[PDB]
From Swiss-Prot:
Disulphide-bonded residues: none
Residue spans of the Sequence repeats: 2-56
Encoding gene per record: spg
Protein name: Immunoglobulin G-binding protein G
Protein's cellular compartments: Secreted, Cell wall
Source organism (scientific name): Streptococcus sp. group G
Full-sequence portion shown in this chain: 303 to 357 of 593
Length: 56
């Protein structure tokens, strides 16, 4: 299934989609993406829209 990430960093910003088996796998992928970019903050997940956000 397709999941979305909105990455709202101070100087790094993005919207991504990933194909993942389930939400736990999407979360894993997106958390690793944000961590490699040095972006951490408040995380959100909305199952109805299959959307994660991270805001610094
Ligand atoms: Cl895994
Ligand atoms: Na930042
Ligand atoms: Na989790
Ligand atoms: Zn796995």
């Amino acid at each position: 299934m397709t999941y979305k990430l909105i990455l709202n960093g101070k100087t790094l910003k993005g919207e991504f989609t990933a194909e993942a088996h389930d939400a736990a796998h999407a979360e894993y992928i997106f958390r690793a993406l944000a961590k490699a970019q040095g972006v951490d903050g408040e995380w959100t997940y909305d199952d109805a829209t299959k959307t994660f956000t991270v805001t610094e």
